[PDB]
Amino acid sequence: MGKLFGTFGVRGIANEKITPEFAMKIGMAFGTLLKREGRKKPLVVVGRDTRVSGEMLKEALISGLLSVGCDVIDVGIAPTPAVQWATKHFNADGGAVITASHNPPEYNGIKLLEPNGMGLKKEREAIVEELFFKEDFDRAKWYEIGEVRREDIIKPYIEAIKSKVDVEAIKKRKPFVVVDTSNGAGSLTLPYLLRELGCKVITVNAQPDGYFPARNPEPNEENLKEFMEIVKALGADFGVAQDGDADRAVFIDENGRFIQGDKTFALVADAVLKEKGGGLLVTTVATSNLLDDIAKKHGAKVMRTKVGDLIVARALYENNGTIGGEENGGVIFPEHVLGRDGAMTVAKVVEIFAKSGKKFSELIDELPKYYQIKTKRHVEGDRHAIVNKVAEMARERGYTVDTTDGAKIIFEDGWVLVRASGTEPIIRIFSEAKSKEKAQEYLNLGIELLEKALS
């Protein structure tokens, strides 16, 4: 995936690409990097999700770390954001999460973390890859081999989230929430957090089980078809579903309607920015203008970064941003953890709901309305130079083009984005407007320029 790592960690099938030797070498390379950066005895936090191959890979990874002189805190099974939270909490020099997130049961992987818990920086990850391939490890002398201890972080993590919201307000309202944790790591946290916040809680698939009996742990609309019906059948105020490692949270309103991630992101940013009375919202060039509206509303600045994992988190961190998020939501609360944390998002949404005196559907529908369309066209060759041409033309034709990440034709009412995938031979086309008509027009405008660029 870039020789070793992908956008945020590496994954593959357990015992094929992701073997114990693989996990052990990753631990030895990471530990060696930590020592060469100037640490005599690094402290590394290690956690994992509910996958069946997790224990075996965790032992291999930890064995590697101890062998190169690093002390280890094994936090056991916990949501990825909890492991990131714990890395910062224990003042560790780094962290590692054994997980393949939303993938089928046979998959697993590893995510490395900075001392503050955020995804490992690319420059440091480059060194880890290099040490991994060369097997250039600084093995400890016998009397410098690291030690490992276990820490249970479930209660501390839940308490850290609760301290961030108005629990009395929530208990007063007593929202009725249904939650599906997809047999994942969130099974150990979200149901308990919701009850402690003061909610009436019903759960679906909340028994931790790496076999993922309910379904592959990916909360897309297709997979939640039954869950949505259950939300409506129970007459709950709303429903929430998480992916396997629980970094994501997907919301369903009282009518069983699947809510788009950017809407709950807007809902949370609105409350957060109002609280600070301004600040800085960080998101990508592909996120809805709805977020610009929320930011303006509170006099907050907006930063639009390229699309991709860790980019928003890194920008939030480097610019002391207030709140961050992306196209599909994935809200990042800087004061909590510099990483997407669906449990924190749910807590904040529960608080907003409890204070609104409205129905979940109303909170969503009351937000500025926008319409968007998407398309993907197969393109080979210098797929990227093709997008550059679309930009030139657009500009030549009098169009305002933003080339932060691809070709984004900017209108007053909306926009059109022509961006080339960084992995697959595709050059997707996204559009948004305040009406289906304009969205369609803008979309076609993009397709038009694309084709003439391909001829």
- Interface residues with Mg ion (CB under 5 A)? 101, 243, 245, 247
Q: Do 72 and 66 meet the contact criterion of CB atoms below 8 Å apart?
A: yes
**For Mg ion, the closer CB: 58 or 298:** 58
Least separation, in Å, of the C-beta of 445 and Mg ion?
35
**For Mg ion, the closer CB: 71 or 106:** 106
Rounded-to-integer distance, Cα 305 and Cα 292, Å: 14
Is 245 a known ligand-binding residue? yes
Nearest by Cα to 180 from 150, 215, 151: 215
Q: Do 229 and 209 meet the contact criterion of CB atoms below 8 Å apart?
A: no
Is 421 a known ligand-binding residue? no
Rounded-to-integer distance, Cα 276 and Cα 340, Å: 20
Q: Which of 53, 63, 67, 101 is catalytic?
A: 101
Is 101 a known ligand-binding residue? yes
Q: Is 101 a catalytic residue?
A: yes
Least separation, in Å, of the C-beta of 247 and Mg ion?
4
Matching residue, tokens 């396997």: 244
**For Mg ion, the closer CB: 94 or 342:** 342
Least separation, in Å, of the C-beta of 245 and Mg ion?
4
Least separation, in Å, of the C-beta of 248 and Mg ion?
5
**For Mg ion, the closer CB: 190 or 439:** 190
Least separation, in Å, of the C-beta of 148 and Mg ion?
26
Helix (H/G/I), strand (E/B), else coil: 11: strand
Least separation, in Å, of the C-beta of 84 and Mg ion?
12
Q: Do 276 and 220 meet the contact criterion of CB atoms below 8 Å apart?
A: no
- How many CA atoms, within 13 angstroms, populate the side-chain half-sphere of residue 388? 4
**For Mg ion, the closer CB: 125 or 247:** 247
Rounded-to-integer distance, Cα 36 and Cα 34, Å: 6
**For Mg ion, the closer CB: 180 or 247:** 247
Q: Which residue, judged by CB position, is nearest to Mg ion in the bound state? A: 101
**For Mg ion, the closer CB: 243 or 270:** 243
Rounded-to-integer distance, Cα 419 and Cα 380, Å: 14
**For Mg ion, the closer CB: 104 or 299:** 104
The values of phi and psi at residue 422, to 5°, are -90, 0
Least separation, in Å, of the C-beta of 79 and Mg ion?
9
> What is the token pair recorded at 357?
């005196």
Least separation, in Å, of the C-beta of 220 and Mg ion?
12
Is 361 a known ligand-binding residue? no
Cite the annotated binding site for Mg(2+) by residue number: 101, 243, 245, 247
Cite the annotated binding site by residue number: 101, 243, 245, 247
Catalytic residues: 101
